[PDB]
Design a protein around this ligand. Structure first.
Ligand SMILES: [Mn+2]
Ligand SMILES: [Mn+2]
Ligand SMILES: [Mn+2]
Ligand SMILES: [Mn+2]
Lengths: 380, 380, 380, 380
């Protein structure tokens, strides 16, 4: 069973630790390492690869990601390349996928996934405890969108639809690789496409939990997440007229208690995010806001002079999400920048009205937020 | 919608509150109250019935429990009598079921259930927060048995399978009434039967959640649950050779944090439960223990002289359960006692090794226990 | 025992409840109600006074606030007026003080205070659970200042030093009335003065705890605390060169777990508090910042253009506090504004780096912060 | 500053790790290791000692404990011997004391203690988070006794009066060594004597907290604690007619949040403890119970046939404690065995009525239990 590791610019030590863990496992029959470019990180893994495939017995190869899609060359080209090598150049029946930077990795990840895949699941998906102010794309964009567009389906119930940690058996991989929509998704939008089309095609999905597991992403402003945001939203927008059957088997490993050190985590720099909400304005962005409801139009125009976000409550965000679905133009610098400020005001609003009330209150909220969105869409 | 209240020797004011609350609800068309005998509590409901019918504009009937099954005349006869009335004497699309003593009932119970059934679900079950040491039949008998016997199915994933608070649509209620296995189950076993056969027949199920739970029963030795225990185990034993499919659509409102009073609650009298373990011994029971694995035989026989329960861990209980499934005879006095004592040692073991570790541990233990039983059963 | 209720424009029913509850208490001999003006709220208490005096057998007087001090005519004048009445017009061994708006007052407040004074304590202070983001004057001004100036003493260990709920014995109340520093403190600063001088004069102190806290004030920008802030800081500034002994006996009932509603509460309007930071600037304030360390000068001057607060960590606030102690002028409009803005940046910093981590973190941060200030001050 | 390590039969690896940590510290000027006997453990430390005093620079000697007291040769002779070597054979001004088995040890222990001792404290006392069913001697014997006998004093407010982790400056050590009562306390009673006489003599006491720190003592029945119990109680009994001034300066480092893995700990084997309550009976123990109140006499006599403990509530225990103070004869096998069963019934009662309600509820209880005991004694 193949085990793929997409990397780019990560410290090669951590990666190579995870690759050793993988090759040692008695249920892993090959390891593939798909780099972004021929940098020093990649050069390091290419020299290390002959060594690990000798001590452990299992072969380990390294390849550059190919240009398979039509958007930005990113995560999507890397994962779809792994698919091409899995189907066309080997004959294994199971492929794993793990982020390279994961310092929390262990043998318990790979075993659980293979163990669940024995019950016959086409797709096993890992999911971990996340801080109340992390995962804001997941919650306010991916899950909210799935809730508002496909409330009766399993889509919005998937815990971490942007997650790169998963297993997929051969038929499932082959189906995704042949699918024109996922093939062209060469950027951050790929995880959204794997998730959406597996559910649409009736693939049965287990979700593995991981008690404690994640590499605390970097403390900066919400700016750092800007590219991922506009691409993840575009992905959902591109799927908005698709139809999805209700039936699809879906189960999820019970979540163990969130460890303290994750519940006590802050997901972003509040000051930098407020400052950034006042930057990069343009007369067209002000013109384009006329398309939104009055409180949102008025609210965000205030951000030219001072930070504003109390306006962007749960309802305001839904109303804003519908307008974005209709009018957002991927690749348009003004539309991309407005999405980023709007989403920012939502993150700030939720942070001070919800997160600030404590990690528990944040979890109950977020599950219940999806519930009301589900209900509001089913009605209309 | 019909709203049914099965009652016994209840505070008549606690019952009449819930009757008035349901009759005032705009989605409710009728209220039925079922009791076994025309005792003082019954004549009160009948004498009040005309007054509530005027004030709310909703008819309020009161009927006797009829003998429709062939086991002990109990809860099942009462619930199936309401199904009968609902199908033969009315023409409403929906029926509710609520225990009478619940002192937490507000109009929100009926509102959330009817909103859930709009989505189109055929069954809506209410689930609640419970204490680590309540729900020991639910956990160690009903769910455990579902997990051991039908691991690949939805049965062990249902939260409150013995719960009597629920909503069915006319077609679901009809199917259950016509079914000979549920008709016969006149005793405590009925909730197990409604749960099992709806899952077998591919009924779509939503699980509502009421934020403030039920009203907690009397604090006494496990002694009080003895009849419920044998009858719930018999229900499952009776279904043991049934076949059940993998598919049946199942969802559930997200649970809110347990309230303090519930997490800080002891479910039973530990002293009295220990004392009871050394009582009602017979020679025959001593010999019957020969059918069990050695640690369970030696473990329980100790209880003639002093309370023992360390031996009855999670594995030993699974092995015990399998032996009971093959040899336990509902109505054989010694078999019933041995089940009572065997389950008591599980509860005590669970209490001292799990419940005593804090409520959050208790919940996570319990969701994971079902996981392990599921897995063992699938791999054999 | 005398029981004093200082009131303003309160719901007259909320006040009269607390008056009736105290008058019915068997350990209470008189109740005094003090207000500034004979407004509608005052005439209500006077018109009801004869009726309560009959029903409970306890006299109920109502007096005007007299001008006994030389600062703003405020809380101090009212509290010292009650001390006057208590010492010159009655002969009771004890006096109570309770804010009027507290909607949580039961007879247990007076019971626990009088039981504590039996042990023989001269002061009994009530303390409560508060939210991470309430009590920002208490923490960052009163306690912080006690810790920096008198680290080897009991002052910074008192829980609710600005709290007006307390009991004194006749001898303690007499000492405070005769003291020229507390007599003069007619404004918000009075609670600081009662706290400080009782500790200086070796009064023995018990700290009662009421399990359900106060009634929480209005949700608005830090703006509302502005007068309280300057006046509380001035109180401490005014005592800065005092000497205080190491010995003064001090104990405190153990605190019970905070209730959910309190731990999940935001103390202030984060948007409005940020906006307020960019308002009411003057050139003079810009120049005054020259007295401060460079990071605080650059940090606050940013606020003319956009909200900044990361720079105002725990150390920078200590350095800021020392500069304020030497240069702050109560009544100089620009000094008061700069304190307001400086303290606002501390509160915001604290909020985003500490409070947002969960209520349990907030408490432990705060007890440890006092520890570190204490230590720095002792080692210099 | 000397740093003493009393050992006996501990694994020498852990000990020698702690001794290396100590000798490295720049504020530690010597290390003394007082063994119980000349076993293999001691022989191992004697060969290792010349090595550690070479790499680190600080000298390290090992001595056998001397016979200084009149009771069992135990902890007390070991600690008092350290005192003799500290005063008579060196000239250091500070002596530490640490349990040998502590696997959680670090540099943060020694630094904090020396740092607090700079403020001038005669006695610094470490204290750590403990499980709800550990520390049952501390709570039901030492602290309860201090509360019932000396309620107005600081004695019962000391967090861990049986703790061996502390620092004491020269004058304090010399005072204890000269004190005839502490010198003769050669057994488990010594910690009680250090605590009692330091408070009686007005020694000023800081309590260091340790966030996470303790070696989970062995999982067995309450039997394992039997010797410590009868000696710790005897110690209190021997002090019951002493007089204690109220004044004595006392402060304590704020406790950080209890880590999960300690809150999820079970302090003893419930089954073995119940069985043991039915063992070692004697006609004289039944005769001696006639001296106790009726519910306690009747309750414990039941334990001849079956385990009983619901009787032994908080009040029953106090009434029982007073009778024990008057009639308990140290060294008498029947009196010692009755104390052990009585205390056992109290532990079991608290475990199932208090601990079982969750670690938080257990902490609030135990602080409040001391409060009522304090109040009940002050009255009478
Ligand atoms: Mn990553
Ligand atoms: Mn009931
Ligand atoms: Mn107020
Ligand atoms: Mn030890």
């Amino acid at each position: 069973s193949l085990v793929v590791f997409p990397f780019k610019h990560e410290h090669p030590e951590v990666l190579l630790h995870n690759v050793r863990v993988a090759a040692a496992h008695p249920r892993v029959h090959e390891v593939l390492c798909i780099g972004y470019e021929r940098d020093q990180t990649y050069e390091a893994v290419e020299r290390a690869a002959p060594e690990i495939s000798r001590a452990t017995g299992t072969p380990v190869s390294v390849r550059l990601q190919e240009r398979l899609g039509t958007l930005r060359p990113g995560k999507g080209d890397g994962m779809n390349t792994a698919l091409r090598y899995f189907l066309e150049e080997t004959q294994w029946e199971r492929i794993h996928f793990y982020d390279a930077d994961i310092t929390s990795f262990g043998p318990d990840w790979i075993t659980k996934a293979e163990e669940a895949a024995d019950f016959g699941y086409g797709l096993v998906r890992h999911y971990f405890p996340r801080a109340s102010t992390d995962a804001m794309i997941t919650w306010m964009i991916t899950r909210t969108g799935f809730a508002l567009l496909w409330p009766h389906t399993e889509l919005s119930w998937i815990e971490q639809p942007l997650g790169g940690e998963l297993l997929m058996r051969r038929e499932v991989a082959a189906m995704l690789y042949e699918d024109e929509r996922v093939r062209r998704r060469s950027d951050w939008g790929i995880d959204t496409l794997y998730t959406f089309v597996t559910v649409q095609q009736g693939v049965s999905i287990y979700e593995c939990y991981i008690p404690e597991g994640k590499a605390h992403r970097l403390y900066g402003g919400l700016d750092d997440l800007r590219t991922m945001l506009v691409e993840c939203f575009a992905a959902i927008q591109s799927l908005q007229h698709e139809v999805v059957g209700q039936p699809a088997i879906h189960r999820q490993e019970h979540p163990h208690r969130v460890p303290v050190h994750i519940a006590e985590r802050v997901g972003y720099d509040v000051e930098a995010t407020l400052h950034r909400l006042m930057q990069h304005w343009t007369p067209r962005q002000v013109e384009l806001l006329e398309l939104f409801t009055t409180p949102v139009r008025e609210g965000l125009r205030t951000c030219q002079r001072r930070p504003a976000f109390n306006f962007m409550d749960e309802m305001a965000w839904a109303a804003t999400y519908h307008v974005l679905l209709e009018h957002f133009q991927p690749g348009d610098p003004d539309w991309e920048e407005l999405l980023f400020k709007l989403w920012t005001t939502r993150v700030l609003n939720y942070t001070m009205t919800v997160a600030l009330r404590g990690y528990d209150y944040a979890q109950q909220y977020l599950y219940r937020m999806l519930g009301r969105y589900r209900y509001q869409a089913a009605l209309e």
